[PDB]
């Protein structure tokens, strides 16, 4: 068997129920081989708080040796394994979902086997292992993982792009969760630098992929889902940080035919407004946030309101002079992108035509984010 | 119709391409060695980027207005593709919701067990510290 059997103060064979672990949690007998611990919840509870050095060394050695020996495409051409490797990786991933941290053996294996990876053998397990990476400086970890990941990212299909975006979102969530508890105990500014660099890196990746894939909405949904998690850093984790996504993504999402994309964009804009107005009042108390972010957000909001119902679509981004429309033959352009004449709302307009103050109908259709944005903007 | 305009534009661009190729065909070849390869390539990259920036700055959005039927057909095709995109998005969202519910249940159970074990350990600590 890949996992060593359970073999032998308090005797180990008598430990069979949760109350027994509760009574003798302080004194326990460690197994001869730590591999048998990998599939035992009761021993996992004890190891959850041990932080003992020889224990960690033994576990690291055993896990690294097992992973190196059981690989399919590294150091050996052995495809006979198949499902055994997948089951072992699933067990490891389930174990590290507990303990709220990852082992160094997995990080070493990822550093070792990533360049030779093809991107199709064990995509799910590898992309789940990537999320459990210990926090470190972005500059040190970039050449080891992110270079190869970006090289593999630009030459694969759209599904690979969506999968890596999901993995990056999970990694960002884990990093934020771990950094949140630190302040309750490199300084803060030296650590926010890494997350800012990561956000800029993923934004650049998203922009390039959006350009490559000929404006596909399927990837746009994943990008917007990632930025939904990005938007609430200051509120959810009480960390001072506000980062805005590039104008390319904003102007690709605003001028899309999908209604759900518009709803998600309105929700994200409302979340930015709430976070900014919550942080501005606390800035006076803590006294630094750059104002340039404030002007960029103001420009975005101005463009949004001008395109929605203000009949002023020609903002800072859409700097289109009227002579092009005049020579083309466009007479009514002020209220052409409005709620009534927007291409995304064409279906709703046709549906309401068969049956004037139809905003309630749109809200009843499920446009919750637009309603929230309208309530937050008018008031 | 606009088809004649498109054909004329393609022909003019092909003629310009031919003239450009004829002008470019008068430059000699330059081969590299293992000792002076990196620096020469870097210099050539710098020159090419400088040329491309100026080329991109001069470009302007072309109007070339078309008819209305072609726009209608393009919109029809866009809606047709958007249908399948929406159905795939819906299926992925359903799978995500199912996984989220399962993970929520598992995390709740783990939290309960952790609370129990923490309480037991704290009671044992109090008992040992009392004696």
């Amino acid at each position: 068997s890949v996992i060593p059997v359970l073999n032998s103060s308090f005797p180990l064979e008598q430990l069979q129920s949760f109350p027994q672990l509760l009574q003798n949690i302080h004194c326990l007998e460690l197994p001869s081989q730590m591999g048998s611990v990998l599939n035992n919840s009761l021993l996992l509870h004890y190891i959850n708080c041990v932080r003992d050095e020889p224990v960690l060394l033994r576990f690291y050695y055993w896990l690294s040796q097992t992973l190196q020996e059981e690989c399919i495409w590294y150091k050996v051409n052995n495809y006979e394994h198949g499902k055994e490797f997948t089951n072992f990786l699933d067990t490891i991933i389930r174990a590290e979902c507990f303990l709220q941290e990852g082992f160094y053996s997995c990080e070493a294996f990822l550093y070792k086997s990533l360049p030779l990876w093809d991107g199709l053998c064990c995509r799910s397990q590898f992309l789940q292992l990537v999320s459990w990476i210990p926090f470190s400086s972005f500059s040190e970890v970039k050449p080891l993982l992110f270079d190869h990941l970006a090289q593999l990212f630009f030459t694969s299909t759209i599904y690979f792009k969506c999968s890596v975006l999901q993995s990056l979102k999970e990694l960002l969530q884990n990093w934020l969760l771990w950094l949140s508890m630190d302040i309750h105990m490199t300084t803060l500014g030296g650590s926010m630098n890494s997350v800012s660099k990561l956000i800029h890196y993923v934004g650049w990746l998203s922009t390039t992929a959006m350009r490559l894939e000929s404006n596909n909405t399927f990837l746009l949904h994943f990008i917007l889902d990632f930025y939904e998690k990005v938007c609430d850093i200051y509120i959810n984790y009480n960390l001072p940080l506000v980062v805005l996504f590039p104008p390319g993504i904003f102007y690709s999402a605003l001028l899309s035919l999908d209604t759900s994309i518009l709803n998600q964009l309105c929700f994200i804009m409302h979340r930015y407004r709430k976070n900014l107005t919550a942080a501005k009042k606390n800035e006076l108390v803590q006294k630094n946030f750059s104002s340039k972010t404030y002007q960029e957000f103001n420009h975005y909001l101005t463009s949004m309101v001008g395109c929605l119902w203000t009949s002023k679509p020609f903002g800072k981004g859409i700097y289109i002079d009227p002579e092009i429309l005049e020579k083309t033959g466009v007479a009514e352009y002020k209220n052409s992108l409005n709620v009534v004449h927007h291409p995304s709302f064409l279906s709703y307009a046709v549906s309401f035509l068969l049956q004037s103050w139809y905003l309630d109908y749109l809200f009843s259709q499920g446009l919750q984010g637009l309603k929230l944005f309208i309530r937050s903007s008018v008031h | 119709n606009t088809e004649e305009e498109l054909i004329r534009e393609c022909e003019e661009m092909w003629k310009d391409m031919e003239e450009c190729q004829n002008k470019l065909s008068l430059i000699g070849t330059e081969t590299l060695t293992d000792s002076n390869a990196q620096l020469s390539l870097l210099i050539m990259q710098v020159k090419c980027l400088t040329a491309e920036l100026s080329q991109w700055q001069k470009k302007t959005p072309e109007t070339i207005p078309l008819t209305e039927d072609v726009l209608i057909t393009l919109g029809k095709e866009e809606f047709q593709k958007l249908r399948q995109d929406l159905e795939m998005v819906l299926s992925t969202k359903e799978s995500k919701n199912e996984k989220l519910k399962e993970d929520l249940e598992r995390e709740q159970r783990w939290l309960d067990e952790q609370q129990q074990i923490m309480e037991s350990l704290n009671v044992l600590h109090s008992e040992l510290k009392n004696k």
Binding site: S124, L127, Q128, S163, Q166 | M88, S91, T92, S95, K96
Partner: peptide, 12 residues
């Protein structure tokens, strides 16, 4: 899982 659904969609 989400990835299992993505894989089973990719095969077909």
């Amino acid at each position: 899982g989400v990835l299992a659904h993505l894989e089973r969609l990719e095969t077909q």
